[model samples]
Target: SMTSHSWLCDGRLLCLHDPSNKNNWKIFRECWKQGQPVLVSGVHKKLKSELWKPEAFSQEFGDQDVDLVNCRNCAIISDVKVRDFWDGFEIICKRLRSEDGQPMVLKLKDWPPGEDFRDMMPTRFEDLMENLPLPEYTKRDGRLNLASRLPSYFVRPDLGPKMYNAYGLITAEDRRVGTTNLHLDVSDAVNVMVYVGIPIGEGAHDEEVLKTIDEGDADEVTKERIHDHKEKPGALWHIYAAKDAEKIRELLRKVGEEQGQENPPDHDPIHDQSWYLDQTLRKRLYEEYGVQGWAIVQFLGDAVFIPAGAPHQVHNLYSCIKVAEDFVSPEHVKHCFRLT
Candidate 1:
């Protein structure tokens, strides 16, 4: 229900930092109703645990074997030892570690892979599960979350409170730097950048790179906010509103056609894993297709709430661990039905 005029492409995603001090949910309600994305910072501090580190997972399950993905071809590389991946991952962290004795991808995402992945290590995973990375208002049941509410009428959608784990690769210059491909979920969802390890090495000198410290002490003023804020790294985000999906599709298709390829009716080019909207192309989409969306940079320890049916994708900016939960809100239930 987002009118084109209401979607703001104002170069800044809406943000709320440690808002639980007050009644923040009303503001949350406002954001969701408007179908805007919000960056809720300071989640890691709330939990106060070092359990979010890559070494922690490696120490616990290093010997475990898991499936890893090839970033270039999107093919699964089988049965790599979890410890080995993290062992090599240490190179990046130590390599980038501010001479701090330091610690830290081979795109090692979706490991400990399975339904209710938290079950693999219930003792620790449950700590996070019980904590439920989001704030007070999102905790309510009923209209906002039909996944748990729906009676066993029509099977069910295993839309989850799922974990997405991956190592951070300093990949800005690579053609295949895109970490997650563009895709849409049929239900409303929240994703939290629970933990991040190691700053990136590739963009070491670039201005746009997020500042990471292993360097020096900070100013006493805003130290708590700045300390937690700076060290936590990030992911680059490209999000298109649910309503603009078709316009986006049209542009993707036209570009595909120019290359002498035809997309099957069921084969959505954007969803089919083909484009990254390079600078010139995105500009063209703005001018020719009248389509615009958010290009948000997500940092660690931030909770992002996404509207139902929004097409979104991410590029992890550092060695990071993350989780996501999905639900059905009354406001966007219409999009869910349309999606179905």
Candidate 2:
């Protein structure tokens, strides 16, 4: 029998120099809980072209006339909708003002036809496919050239090509706290982030916070301890392994209850729980239930594989540009379906 461990382990980093048609799903299956936020290196040469550069994006959607966009405000404050396009090209940035006069950080969703980005994104897609497992029963689809075998439910219909396409873009220019808020995606995705411009800052102060607590210098890790950890320069990514979503969700709930006393409960962690728990809570919970969390600092041309139903979040360490997509694999279809 395989050993079962909690998902609190460190994530694994892989450097595959060549794109082999080999699937490592079994390794991922056995160790998904043991290590998460897997980082795959050696594919920079495969990407790093038109899709990975801010200058290329500028030619397509940058410094364009905001008036040219048929924009609408999404119910979600962080996102804005650009209903019009030139050859399916548009721009969404945090500095762009929405109709409501709020800063609109564009999170692009889905793909139509005729966009250059559609074709360019697949180079990274095939790179991901070369290493992921495929199921026997499958069919052809267009969203992602590789997504044909995946059922429609496995793909996020609202977002991209009925098959695969560019799902979203994240851009930053400052060091202000910009958290993507903790959440989960619909299906497993090979997140290929090309940080055209990543920010720099001091590293997180959590280590010192933890050290103080371990030595009994503090009774608890307070909100203050977690809130103001100085961030060093670089994009920070956090992911809980898919197997541990329930555990993370539980802790979020428990933290909510403790903080929600006089104020009504705000179940949404992104908005309310940004600094919900501190090092003490994390260490105490890990000691009690043997579960913790995982983190990664993404760099230029790094590809991160995020499993389905894994609750995760992102913090832009500085001004940066990120392009990512979501896809499904046979091994995790059941888990994805359950999540929906």
Candidate 3:
């Protein structure tokens, strides 16, 4: 029935935004069965802002080394000290262009890779993951969720519960830069935005923020206020349903063809993520094939649950720390195997 479906972003995009209601999952599960993206908005209630927020994280892990990934290609960048990155974070939030006349985007994805959080940081993992008030439908309990149900002897890949801290200095008025280009994950994912920090007024005091960051002999009140402000918007997302893959591929190929680029088989356009569906391109997509996409404003504490095989891209509006856990549901395991 039409009543079972809910729409967001003025399109055919189906979403279920929970109001922290415990029983909302029943309907969210119903919609997830159809393999479109779903949005749940109240996970911050279970979060401890003191630890999950970027300021708090920076204060704790200042000296730790983390690998960064470039936003354009998702390739690994050399390690950098957490303090060095955090001290310059305000500059990134200012949306300034880099020296090369390009937006600078660096992401610390899967920080401390090669192991699951549960195994490496057992106590910290429980303190963070166990308390999340996510819907019963989203968790993998070593039972119904196929990602968890497989036995240990099977040696199934340890798909995270990973940490992601990303900074993007976007170019003014240009939507193509500073983006996690279009890609698909083999398993369903639930990404929660724990905290986001926007640029401070005029950036006149970024030097002060940096000085106070290291100098223990200075004012602490100003630094405290920076973290105590109200929640902020994090990222913008464009997600397409798995069924629209062919339409998206055709659109990309058609656009590529017009640019005098010859199409080559095995050159997956969606995976290549060379095209961003901006307003005009999105309109062309609709006018041509009637395909629709979901646009979401991910705020602090909002958990955006994406179905497996859905093509998605992200544009961060500010510096943020978000975590994602991958799971496989019965509805989309076919896509999982198809990709794997």
Which predicted model would earn the best lDDT?
Answer: 3
Task: Give the alpha carbon lDDT tens digit for every residue of 243-268 in model 2.
Answer: 76666656666766786644344454
What TM-score does prediction 1 earn?
0.78
Please, what are the lDDT tens digits per residue for candidate 1 over residues 236-277?
667778888888888888888888886675568765765766
Where model 1 places Cα greater than 4 Å from the true spot, the runs are: 1-12, 19-22, 93-105, 130-137, 140-143, 151-159, 169-172, 199-231, 338-340
lDDT for each residue of candidate 3 in 1-340, tens digit (9 for 90 to 100): 3233355554444444444456665666667888778766657767666766565556866788776666655566567776656654555443324456654566765664756666655655665566443435456573336876654433233655787677743443335444576778767788888777665544442343233222212123323423574445577778888999888888888788888999884468988867667666778888999987776766777778888889987777667777777776777777655233
Whole-structure CA lDDT of model 3: 0.64
Candidate 2 runs further than 4 Å off: 1-36, 48-51, 63-178, 198-234, 261-289, 338-340
Q: What is the lDDT of candidate 1?
A: 0.60
Which pairs of residues collide in model 1? 168-319
| Per-model TM values vs. the true structure | 0.78, 0.54, 0.76
For each candidate, how many residue pairs have backbone atoms clashing (under 3 Å)? 1, 13, 0
Which structure among the candidates has the greatest TM-score? Answer: 1
- TM-score of the candidate numbered 3? 0.76
